[PDB]
Each structure stands twice: as C-alpha cells, then as structure tokens.
Design a protein around this ligand. Sequence first.
Ligand SMILES: Nc1ncnc2c1ncn2[C@@H]1O[C@H](COP(=O)(O)OP(=O)(O)OC[C@H]2O[C@@H]([n+]3cccc(C(=O)O)c3)[C@H](O)[C@@H]2O)[C@@H](O)[C@H]1O
Ligand SMILES: Nc1ncnc2c1ncn2[C@@H]1O[C@H](COP(=O)(O)OP(=O)(O)OC[C@H]2O[C@@H]([n+]3cccc(C(=O)O)c3)[C@H](O)[C@@H]2O)[C@@H](O)[C@H]1O
Ligand SMILES: Nc1ncnc2c1ncn2[C@@H]1O[C@H](COP(=O)(O)OP(=O)(O)OC[C@H]2O[C@@H]([n+]3cccc(C(=O)O)c3)[C@H](O)[C@@H]2O)[C@@H](O)[C@H]1O
Ligand SMILES: Nc1ncnc2c1ncn2[C@@H]1O[C@H](COP(=O)(O)OP(=O)(O)OC[C@H]2O[C@@H]([n+]3cccc(C(=O)O)c3)[C@H](O)[C@@H]2O)[C@@H](O)[C@H]1O
Ligand SMILES: Nc1ncnc2c1ncn2[C@@H]1O[C@H](COP(=O)(O)OP(=O)(O)OC[C@H]2O[C@@H]([n+]3cccc(C(=O)O)c3)[C@H](O)[C@@H]2O)[C@@H](O)[C@H]1O
Ligand SMILES: Nc1ncnc2c1ncn2[C@@H]1O[C@H](COP(=O)(O)OP(=O)(O)OC[C@H]2O[C@@H]([n+]3cccc(C(=O)O)c3)[C@H](O)[C@@H]2O)[C@@H](O)[C@H]1O
Lengths: 233, 233, 233, 233, 233, 233
Amino acid sequence: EKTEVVLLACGSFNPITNMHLRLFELAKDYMNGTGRYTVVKGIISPVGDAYKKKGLIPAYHRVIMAELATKNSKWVEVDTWESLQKEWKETLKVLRHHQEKLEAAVPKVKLLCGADLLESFAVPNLWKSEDITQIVANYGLICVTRAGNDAQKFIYESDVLWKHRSNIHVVNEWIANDISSTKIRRALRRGQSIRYLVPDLVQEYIEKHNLYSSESEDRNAGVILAPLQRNTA
Amino acid sequence: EKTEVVLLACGSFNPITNMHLRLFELAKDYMNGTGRYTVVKGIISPVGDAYKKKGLIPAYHRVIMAELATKNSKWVEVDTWESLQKEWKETLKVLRHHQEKLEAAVPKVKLLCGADLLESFAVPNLWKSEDITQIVANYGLICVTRAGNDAQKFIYESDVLWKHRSNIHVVNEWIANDISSTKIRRALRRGQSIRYLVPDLVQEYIEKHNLYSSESEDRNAGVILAPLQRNTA
Amino acid sequence: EKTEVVLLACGSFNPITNMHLRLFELAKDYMNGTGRYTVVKGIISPVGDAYKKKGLIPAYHRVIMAELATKNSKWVEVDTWESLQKEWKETLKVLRHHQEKLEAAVPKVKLLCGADLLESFAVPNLWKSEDITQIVANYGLICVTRAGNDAQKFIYESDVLWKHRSNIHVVNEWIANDISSTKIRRALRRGQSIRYLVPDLVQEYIEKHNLYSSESEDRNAGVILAPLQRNTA
Amino acid sequence: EKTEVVLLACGSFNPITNMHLRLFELAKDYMNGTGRYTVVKGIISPVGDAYKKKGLIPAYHRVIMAELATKNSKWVEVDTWESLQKEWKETLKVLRHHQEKLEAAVPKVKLLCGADLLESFAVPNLWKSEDITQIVANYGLICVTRAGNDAQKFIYESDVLWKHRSNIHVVNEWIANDISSTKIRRALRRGQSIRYLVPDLVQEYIEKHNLYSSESEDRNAGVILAPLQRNTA
Amino acid sequence: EKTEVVLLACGSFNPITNMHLRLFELAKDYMNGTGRYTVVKGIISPVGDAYKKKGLIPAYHRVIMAELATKNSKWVEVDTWESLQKEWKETLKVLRHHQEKLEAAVPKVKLLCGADLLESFAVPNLWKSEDITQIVANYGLICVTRAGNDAQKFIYESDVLWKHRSNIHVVNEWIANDISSTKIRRALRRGQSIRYLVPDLVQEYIEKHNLYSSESEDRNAGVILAPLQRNTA
Amino acid sequence: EKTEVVLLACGSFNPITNMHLRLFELAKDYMNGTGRYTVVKGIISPVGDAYKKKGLIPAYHRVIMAELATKNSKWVEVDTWESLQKEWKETLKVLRHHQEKLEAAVPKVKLLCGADLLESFAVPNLWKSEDITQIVANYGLICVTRAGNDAQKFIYESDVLWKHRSNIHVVNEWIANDISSTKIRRALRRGQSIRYLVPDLVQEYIEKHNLYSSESEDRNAGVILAPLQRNTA
Ligand SMILES: Nc1ncnc2c1ncn2[C@@H]1O[C@H](COP(=O)(O)OP(=O)(O)OC[C@H]2O[C@@H]([n+]3cccc(C(=O)O)c3)[C@H](O)[C@@H]2O)[C@@H](O)[C@H]1O
Ligand SMILES: Nc1ncnc2c1ncn2[C@@H]1O[C@H](COP(=O)(O)OP(=O)(O)OC[C@H]2O[C@@H]([n+]3cccc(C(=O)O)c3)[C@H](O)[C@@H]2O)[C@@H](O)[C@H]1O
Ligand SMILES: Nc1ncnc2c1ncn2[C@@H]1O[C@H](COP(=O)(O)OP(=O)(O)OC[C@H]2O[C@@H]([n+]3cccc(C(=O)O)c3)[C@H](O)[C@@H]2O)[C@@H](O)[C@H]1O
Ligand SMILES: Nc1ncnc2c1ncn2[C@@H]1O[C@H](COP(=O)(O)OP(=O)(O)OC[C@H]2O[C@@H]([n+]3cccc(C(=O)O)c3)[C@H](O)[C@@H]2O)[C@@H](O)[C@H]1O
Ligand SMILES: Nc1ncnc2c1ncn2[C@@H]1O[C@H](COP(=O)(O)OP(=O)(O)OC[C@H]2O[C@@H]([n+]3cccc(C(=O)O)c3)[C@H](O)[C@@H]2O)[C@@H](O)[C@H]1O
Ligand SMILES: Nc1ncnc2c1ncn2[C@@H]1O[C@H](COP(=O)(O)OP(=O)(O)OC[C@H]2O[C@@H]([n+]3cccc(C(=O)O)c3)[C@H](O)[C@@H]2O)[C@@H](O)[C@H]1O
C-alpha cells in the first residue's frame, strides 16, 4: 500500500543542532501525514573533510556529535560512508549508495534538506545539471523551510524542478526556529550559552574538546569549495 | 561593584518550551556581559489559575512541567507562590513578594520577559498605569526579543518607559527562535512531534497525561482575563 | 483510477473579469496536472440580488456577462439557479444543489475560490461553522491565490481546515494579475478603457447598457450583507 | 487647443500579451485626461530578429501575433518596418523613422514603454548616452508602471532625465498587472493554459503552431544582445 | 501666460519646524518648475484655539513663533485671520477668505499640505464632503510628501479627488526630513535638544517661555475636535 | 564617577548640513542621558583635500562653512588639523592627535558618526583592520542612525565590534532626517532651494560663491580614494 521511505540528509553538521534533528521530525510528520507514505528511518550523513567548506572542522568530531545527538533517537541514525571516502562525494552518489545498500518492496531513499540547499542548485558551477535531474526525478527531495513561498517559487522557476514537482515536497516549518551552525559557532567563539539550541551531549562534547574558535573558523580560508574546483577544472 | 540580580520570569508556561529556557540564557549572558551585573538565579513563576487565560490548563501540571524542564539547571528554579494564590496576583505584587523574600547587599529582582509582555502594557485596561511605573522605576525589566527596534521604539513612545529607560534592558535575540506555547498546543492536538522544541521530560510528561487538546483549549472560553475583569468592574 | 471533478465558483461577479475566467484555467490545469483528477466542467454561479452587497447590480446583467464571457468556453458554463432563488442562498446549499443535480461514477462538485473567500471563513458570523466543515469535508475547496503562504498559513491556523487539508488545494497564481471587479467598476465610472481586462463581449455589453455608475455603486448602501443578517436574527 | 500624439512602442512582443495592449489603453486615457494632448494612433513595432535576444522567435510570428492582437483595435496598429530591417535598429532611429514618416500641424511621436525599458537606460553600454538625451528631449517618453515611485526615483537621480522631466510622463498602473512574456513562454513550454492572459486569436495562433518550446527558448543562447555588441566593438 | 499662485498652508503649527518652512520651498520650486505657474507668496495661517486639538497651545504663541520663523523669509508670511475668529474655521472658508482678500489678473490661492492632511479627507465626519469637492475643484491642492505613491493612490481611490486630479499636485520630498511637531513637543518634554530642527529664534522663544510640558500636552484632553463636534450635532 | 568625553566627527562635510549638527545634539543627549558620561566638547574635523573623494570641493570652503554652521554653538567647534595635512590622514591618527592634544582626569575622545561610516568598515581595503580594532577598543565610537538594528546587527556580525560592544553606543534617531550632502549638491546643481536643510549662513555662503555645480561634482573623477589607493599600493 503506502510507500516506505528513508529520509537521507547530507550536510556538514558543523555542528548539528536541534534544528537539524527537528528537520527530521517535520519531514516525518508530513510524509506520514499524507497517508501515502511510511517513514521507516532517518539517516544523517556528515560531509567528508574533502568538501573544504570554510570553518569545516574534522569529520570525526562532526560524526561523533551527530551520533551523540541521535543516541536518544529511535529512528534517526548516522551513516559514516560519505565521511570516510577520500574524495568529496556528490550528493547524487551518496543517494545512489544508500539506495543500493537497501537493495541487500524496497524503501525509497529521498534527500532531506532546507530551502538553503535546494536553492544552491542555481549557484553557477555548484551542481551538475544531470545530477539535479536525477536527484529529483529518481529519488525525490523533501524541503523543509520557513520561507515556503521562496522554495515554491524556486521550483516554479526551474523547468526541471517543475517537471518533477510531484516528487518534490516543500514542508512548511510554521514554528519559526533557525538555529544555524554559523550562529552556534559564533556564540561558542564568544563564550555564550548554546544550551537548549543543541542536544546536551553535543553541548558537553563541544565543551570538553573546546571546539569552534577563531582558529577553527579559519580552516579552508581561501580554498575553493570541492564541487566548484571540480566543475572549473 | 557589580549589582547581583535575580531574573524573575512570570508567565503562563502553558507549556514551558525551549524558548522560555533560552530566554534565561540570553538574559544572563547579556546582563553579565555588560560587566556591571552578576546574575545569581533564575526564577520561573507560573501564573495561578485565577488568571483565566483561555486554554490555561491546571497550575499544578504547569508547575510540574517547569520543574521537569529545570531539573538540570544549576541556577534556574521554579517558585509556586503565584500558582497558589486564590486571587490572581498583579506582577508588581509578585515582584514585591520576591524582592521582600530575598531580604531574609541584597540582590535585585528584575522582571524577565519578551516584547510580547512589554507591548501589552498598552492594551487598554490590561495593566494598572501606576503599576507599569513602579515596575520599571523600582525593579527593572529585561526584555528579550527578535525585534529589538520595535521594543526600542515602543519605549521611546512612552514618557514613563523612556524616562526610566535605564532600567529597561532590551536584549537582542539574534538566533531566530519562535517556539510559542500556542504553536506547541496546536501541534499536540494534531499529534505532531514537538520533540526538541521542549525538553524531553516535559514532552514525555505531556504525552503521558494527554495534557493538551481541543477540550483543554476551550478552558475559560468566553471568560474575561483576570486583569481586564478587575479593571472593568 | 481518476476522479471526474466539477469546479463550482460562487461569487458576485460584479462584473466578471479576465481574472475570474483565469481562475478556472489555473485550477483545471492544476487538478488535471496532479494526475488524480480530470476536470470535466466549470460552473459560474452568480449570487442572487438578495446578497445585498454594496454596489451589486442586478443579477440578470451579471448572469448575461458571465454568459458572454464563457460563450466560447468549451467547458465553463453559467448556472442561473442560485440567482433565481428568492432568498439568499448559502454556498453549502448551492454546492448541494449542483452535486445532487449531477446525480441524475458521478463527478464530484468542488468549490473554486480565491484567498479572499477562504479567509472570510474567519469573519465573525459570516459563515455557519458547520457549513465550513461540510464544505471542506464533503465537497472540497480549490483556492487560487498569489499569496499562497498566506492561504496555507490560514489553513494551518484552523483546526477544521488543517484537518481536511487533503481536500483543500491551494493553487499558486504565478502570473500575478489582479483585475478586481472593484477596480473595473471604478475605471468605468471614470470613463476609462477596460478593454483587455474583460472579454470583448463583456466590455461591449457593459458599454452598450452603461452598467456601472456612482448610482449602482450606492445600491444596498447601509444594508447589512445577507449572511450577516441571518446570523444576527 | 491640443497637441496630437502618436504612441510608438518598441519591444520584442515575444509574444504580445494583454498587458502590452493594456499599455496603450492606459497611456491614451492618461494623455487625453490631461486635456493638453490628443492621442491619434498607437503603433506597435516588433524588434527585428537581429536583436539576438535569448528566446526571441522569428519576427514573422511576432508581427502576425501583434496583428491578430490588434485586428479589433480602432486606433492601435502594427508597423513591420523595424522588423523587416536586416540590421538591428536603435530606438532613436525608429522614433525618427516614424516622425519623418508622418511629415509625409504634424503629430508628435512619443515612446511608449514600461518602467522596465526606462530603467534599462542605466545598463552599462546598453543605450548611447546621446540617444537617451535625444529621445527624452526631442521625442518624449510615456512610461507606464506599477512602481511609480521607482520610475520617479530613477528620473530624480539622473540629472539628464530630471532636466527633461516635463517630457517624461510616468503613468500609474493601479490594476497590479504582471503578465510578462517570460511567464507566458514558461507556461506554454509546460502545456499550461494562457487563455485570458493574451487575446484569443493570439492564444489560438500560438497553440495551433506550437510556437514556444525549450528549443525556441534557446535561440541566441550565448549570443550578445545587438546593442551590447555594437557598443563594445 | 503663467498663472500666479499664492500657497496657503492651514495648520496647527504647534510648533512650526524647519519642515513646515521646507514645505514651502519645495512647493515653490515645483510650481515654478512646471513652467506654467509663478508662486508669488506663501501664507502660513495658524488654526484658532477653537480647534480644541489635544495639546494645542494658545494661538498667540503659535503665531509669534511662525512670524519669528518667517522674519527672514522674503516670500512666506503669517496671516492671523483664522486664529482671530472665535469660531473654529473650516479650511474651505479660510481659503475663500484669502482668495477674496486678493481681489481687493488676480493670483489663485491653492492649499498647501502634507499627505497627512490630504488623507484625513477619509476620516469619518472630519471633512464635509462638499468642502473637499470645492477645495480641489475651485482652488487646488499641493501635497508635499516622502510617500508620493501613497498620496497618488489615495487620490486614485477617490472619485472626487481623481476627477479634479489636474488641480491636485503631489510633490515628492526626495530629501526626507520629518520633524513632526509631536516629536518636538516630546523632545521638549524630555529636555532634549531641538536645535537645528526649528529655526533658531523659534528654538529660543520656546526656551524662554518654557512652552511645551506634560501639562500642555493635556490641553483639550477628552475634548472632541471642533470639526467632529460640528458634524455630529 | 562620570567620564568626560569629547565627540570627534571626521568627515567631508561637503557641505555640512543640519543633519551633521543634529548628530551632535543627539549624541550629547544620549551620553549625558546615560548618567555615566559628561560631554564637554564636540569637534568637527573636515577631511583634507588629499582624501580625493569624488566631488570634494576645497578644504577652505568646507572649513568656513563648518565654522559658519557652528558660529553660535556653545560647545561644538571646528578643528582644521586634518584640513591642513598634505597627506590624507587615517581617522585613527586624527583620534590620536586630539586625544594627545587634550592631555596637555583627561576627557576621552570618541569618534562620532552615522551607521554609514560604521558599515564602511567592511568595504574591502577601505579601513586597515588593526585601526578598526584600535578605534573601538582604545577610543570609542558613537554611531547615530535611523536603522540601529542594522548597526546593531552589523556589530553582532563582526567579532571585533561585538567584542568591543561596550565601547560602541548605537544612538537612535527617531526624528527621520536623511539630509545627505549628495542630495544637497544635487539640489544646488538643479537650482533648488536648500533653505532650512542647512543653517542660513551656510546656505548664504554657498549661494554667494556658487560652490556646487556640475563642474565641482567632477573633481577627482577617475581617482581612487586616498585610503583605497594606500591599501592597494
Ligand atoms: N533553518 C533551517 N531550516 C531548515 N533546514 C535547514 C535550516 N538550516 C539548515 N537547513 C538544512 O540543513 C541541512 C544541512 O545543513 P548544513 O550543515 O548547513 O549543510 P551544508 O554545508 O549546507 O551542506 C551542503 C550539502 O550539499 C552537498 N552538495 C553541495 C554542493 C554540490 C553538490 C553536488 O552533489 O553537486 C552537493 C554537500 O556535499 C553537502 O552534503 C541542509 O539540507 C540545509 O538546507
Ligand atoms: N518568542 C519569544 N521571544 C522571547 N520571549 C518570549 C517569546 N514568546 C514569549 N516570550 C516571553 O515569555 C514569557 C512567558 O510567556 P507566556 O507563558 O506566554 O505568558 P503570558 O500569558 O504571556 O504571561 C502573562 C504574564 O503577565 C502578567 N500580567 C498580565 C497582564 C497584567 C499584569 C499586571 O501585573 O497588571 C500582569 C501575568 O500575570 C503573567 O505573569 C513572557 O515574559 C513572554 O513575553
Ligand atoms: N485576484 C484574485 N485571484 C484569485 N481569485 C480571486 C481574485 N479576486 C477574486 N477572486 C475570487 O473570485 C471569486 C468571485 O469573487 P467576487 O466576484 O468578488 O465574489 P464575492 O462577493 O467575493 O463572492 C462571495 C461568495 O461567497 C458566498 N458566501 C459568503 C459569505 C457566507 C456564505 C455562506 O454560504 O455562508 C457564502 C456568497 O454567496 C458569494 O457566492 C471568489 O472566489 C474570489 O475569492
Ligand atoms: N508589467 C509591465 N507593465 C507595463 N509595461 C511593461 C510591463 N512588462 C513590460 N512592459 C513594457 O512593455 C514593452 C515591450 O516589452 P518587451 O516585449 O519585453 O520588449 P523588450 O525586449 O524589453 O524591448 C526592448 C526594446 O528596447 C530597444 N532597445 C534596447 C536596448 C538599447 C536600445 C538602443 O536604441 O540603444 C534599444 C529594443 O530595440 C527593443 O525595441 C516595453 O516598453 C516594456 O518595458
Ligand atoms: N512630514 C511632513 N511632510 C510634509 N508635510 C507635512 C509633514 N508633517 C506635517 N506636514 C504638513 O504640515 C502642515 C501643518 O502641519 P500641522 O501643524 O501638523 O497641521 P494639522 O494639525 O494636522 O492641521 C490640520 C488642519 O486641517 C484643518 N482641517 C481639519 C479637519 C477638517 C477641516 C475642514 O475644513 O473640514 C479642516 C484644520 O483647521 C487645520 O488647519 C499640514 O498641511 C501637514 O500635512
Ligand atoms: N543620515 C545620517 N544620519 C547620521 N549620521 C549621518 C548621516 N549621513 C551621514 N552621517 C554621518 O556624518 C558624518 C560625516 O558625513 P560625510 O561628510 O558624508 O563623511 P564621509 O565622506 O562619508 O566621511 C568619511 C570619513 O571617514 C574617514 N575614513 C574613511 C575611509 C577609511 C578611513 C581609515 O582611517 O581607514 C577613514 C575619512 O577620512 C572621513 O573622515 C559621518 O560620520 C557620517 O556617517
């Protein structure tokens, strides 16, 4: 009857916050609420250090925090495949990977993201055109966000996205919360409480290892983001 | 040297959410960050049932939820005095109570709140004008908010507030947080996840007792908020 | 397999403009486009003069303009049944009348409207709270609007609406062109051209009979709208 | 008494939409309602294919759609001279061509356009500074727009425009329109109805010959706009 | 040839500020700028204390302040007629008075105001509908404002104003300054400097006679504004 | 107890306006109004011509106008040290010059400016980072503005500014004035009145020397601002 689905969220999780977790809760309620789907699992897949994003701290720290964060979740877990590859991995391959790992009525892996990432699809030389087509046509996208109209319009404004709109779901986040990783690192650098913005275990981990600082924010300064170096060379 | 202050946050807490706890964190960082204050304790004071606010479930439960939410707080505690009054009590009075209670240099009690409360000072018949005066003049008011300029403007537009502006500290909430009790109860009636929006013990306590629903939202329908009744009769 | 559906649009249509016609095109495309419905007919049902809406000219003229406006329409037609009733007719009863009429698998009658009409569900005493429930539950509502987030937010704020959410389809109008009747009447009072804002036949008809004036605009001036009368008597 | 004006609108009309026709009716009512002018003719002049604008279909088709759109216009007509020109023509040369054509009291030829075109005067290398001056100074510019306080701000910021302000008439479009050619093409590529957004004959012509597609949309892709080509070499 | 005009500004001038003076410079530059008018004089006409506007100090101080403000003006002067009547005087009358006094080619008197006043034409019972008609029909209105589009729209929305639009001139205040009398009194009450907001002499007359206070702001507290009493009795 | 401060405002004052003078009234009111500062002097320090800002007329005239503008001020004066420097001086140096001067308790010198200058800190290569740091840390900055949430946010978005937030006082301008020099020059070139936007003497001096024109606006056309030239060579 209903189609089973696995929500896969690729990201930097630098560091993970209640917001990324909350992203899962919302997508699940929505998907299960349509009556035509059953969300069987949530997978958080931290990006490997080969991504080179500014300030991106070492993967093990990010993976451990994301594990610490899901420890009390009953349906959301961390998968380390992508973080372990040596070369940065294109989200479409990370999707094809878990979709195949499942084939061994098979659950459909769908990409879970906020409007943020959905919109980078338009940044020049960031995403391969064929990648986007396959991602929305063969897996599906589930976009959670406050600016529901922005996202809806962004879709309307792209022929590929519009064509596969049946396979793309914008999920409104009426409870306006935005605990951005950037604001968190900022708060940390400035010695301010992030208590209640991230899970206590993550907060404790960050504290013990004294993660995030001016030094850390500088990692990868002046280094082009992996996806771009690829489409420029 | 520094003025020790106690942050008293009066409200319904129907139910307490991460946002209300976040409020104490912000205010603490801000007050200590000024260098001229030392925040020694936070006090969550739920409103007795005589308030009659629409949807207000029993005080005892709201008190229990606040204690649950603060089990793991080293400086924020709950105070039941207000919840025990047969007669709804005016915030000015609650403040006098705590200030007088503290005397037994003595820390100063300041009312912690959002811009929602500050602005309601202008709702007709809601607050006693002479009360607004002694609150800001004699105690103080720490107002946390996402719209700092509207709060600023609101203060500038009132001779009483402006005059005593040195006792009104507008605190900026750069991390967009809007976890309103109203949206929580709304999610609850619909069976949606409210995990990571409220502390877990609070979510668990609520799930267990089915505290929020259509029927509870109707409590006090047609009844006049206590303060308004008292200033019209 | 696919649900045959009929779009019924109740409204004053005083006068009908390219915009009301556009409503039918946008909705049909959407429904047909979701793959689960097949729009077979469009019905324009001008409200009866008993509505007593400020500026409402005689129904017969409004009916005829709707006829001219759809004279070339392959699928949209004009039904005079509601206008011919002596008493003002609630939309629920008109929906029933037309659904019952079709039953003589039968096609499902759905209410076609704009954000305007949807949000008026919240005007005190305007709609019976049960008529609303039966409309969204037993019939369905297709709401066309430029401000989609507002319409959706309106659904999210209403338990009843949110509850029958799967029967309420918000359709985005990306080609934002609000040719309101109010601006058409004003333009005619000032002798402006309204050509290309309404179908030529309607334009020509209006000029020939000199329909809109300061006079017609004063019709029902001071009379309380029919739905509000009923709900006060 | 009055000055007899002829409104010349140069543009691509790819394809012409109700809003373009609406442009003429708006301007005629405004110029005539000042009491000091008399609009005697409206001329639509489709740009030639040599303009190399992305997505621009053959002038043959744009001319014929412009003609069907105006077949029932008592005062607006189409002039094929600009399009039939092997070379792309500067608007100044087209204005001139038409003025001179008339002198063979002579009606003043004025440029009819939207805030769009007017604001493009600031696009580096798009318009020759002297051609701008000569258009506003020797011909006149009637700019229809929804954003009157932009067209106005733009004139107030250009010493040149401001100096000839008396010859630049900003006409307000109160019926918030937006039927852009881009959005019509997008809809046609998506097989969506455009009925009631353009004249029936144009709709029928476009449908019958499947004029707009992904293919047509790609015409000239990578080709620099004729004006930019000229002012850079 | 050119029409001579006298700009009459009816207002409370409580107190007058650089902005009121500014109003005249702006209007004069505009009227003269059109090339078809010649501004030969400006007239500031303080409202009589019979207006009963809350906080309105005595006419004599307002008149002396306005004369002091215009001491150095070569073309703007104060007329005391209005302020000298025992009965509050309808602006249409104040206009008729000055126009008749000029006939003693003959300069046309036109009312000079901000958007504030133009728009108050809508407030229920504030202006006798026939007065508005005569003012825009038989004299003319020059409205200076930062919100040129609002005034423009407000006119568009009024059949009366729109019909005589050729006699109404909206003049754009590009160098936005908004020294409202209200903010001046507020600043004064608070002991804040008003230097450089009003003319030095005015600023010095207020300092000398301690004109604005809490006390004064209360004048006419609870007294219905004169025009309102008249149109409700 | 209270700290004596001197407000130093570095800028072009090309030409000085009411607004620049306004800046000192506001800031003196704010600082003394905090109860912990005593503002003893205001200093207008016009920039030397070595600055090379486009359109900057000769130092001498700017200095004279500043003196005419402040002739009658009890506490605000003009210091020509910057105007007399052959090489453009970095604001830090000016601040250092005055501070040292005073030391011959000693008043603290603080930079007075608008949000405009503050935000210019992010213009690439405009200000030397070590300078920004030294200015906010060792001297102080009082920023006046109508968009103080933009200044508040700009401070919050920079670690250095945030780190020194205690030394940066954002002062709200509730009376909305944006009488910029650029708009004044635009008005003068167009022959419009600027009476009441600048003090009378200043306006009289500009009119007598015909200081601002198309020609003057061209000074330094094509030359890089001193600061930018320095940090790029
Ligand atoms: N407030 C908010 N509300 C709702 N969702 C929010 C959010 N803030 C972040 N999010 C979402 O959180 C998730 C993770 O956030 P964050 O830690 O910031 O993750 P971020 O660094 O933005 O992750 C970018 C991801 O895209 C992948 N990518 C980028 C570029 C090209 C290609 C390619 O295959 O060509 C792939 C990349 O490998 C990485 O997995 C995202 O889905 C983001 O949109
Ligand atoms: N998004 C947000 N960001 C920051 N702060 C936010 C917030 N949403 C709520 N808050 C704050 O959270 C706190 C608790 O909220 P909530 O639980 O909804 O509490 P609420 O019902 O708004 O609390 C009303 C309180 O005001 C008192 N009151 C009302 C009227 C007259 C008088 C009187 O003495 O005359 C006193 C009343 O006794 C009670 O203690 C408030 O201070 C609120 O402003
Ligand atoms: N720009 C725009 N974009 C998209 N849609 C737009 C629109 N402007 C109007 N519309 C829609 O066009 C349609 C016709 O509009 P208009 O001519 O103005 O018609 P209008 O007067 O708004 O029609 C109101 C209708 O609601 C019915 N009603 C009202 C209140 C209570 C009850 C009851 O049963 O209790 C029933 C009433 O009998 C009538 O049929 C509406 O659905 C309107 O919202
Ligand atoms: N919503 C709206 N409301 C009101 N008016 C609107 C409008 N959308 C477009 N318009 C107006 O409709 C008209 C037709 O638009 P569209 O079909 O898109 O025509 P478009 O491609 O924008 O036309 C450009 C025209 O400018 C000429 N041009 C461009 C650049 C440099 C020079 C030169 O001599 O140096 C000349 C060019 O030859 C062509 O005739 C325009 O005047 C446009 O602004
Ligand atoms: N920021 C700004 N930009 C441009 N103009 C601005 C302005 N602030 C005020 N102004 C203008 O300044 C002028 C004087 O300001 P202010 O002192 O505040 O004038 P205010 O008290 O608003 O003056 C009301 C005037 O209207 C008359 N009135 C009222 C109601 C009904 C009738 C009737 O005949 O039925 C007549 C009344 O007798 C009095 O002369 C006004 O024209 C105002 O709009
Ligand atoms: N509306 C408004 N409200 C409040 N204040 C306003 C204002 N408009 C301007 N102001 C303020 O007025 C003052 C003077 O205005 P204006 O004449 O336009 O001054 P402007 O030319 O913008 O002043 C530049 C100043 O910055 C210094 N600077 C620039 C770049 C790098 C460095 C360095 O050390 O590296 C120093 C420069 O030497 C000069 O003193 C400024 O503080 C400006 O922000």
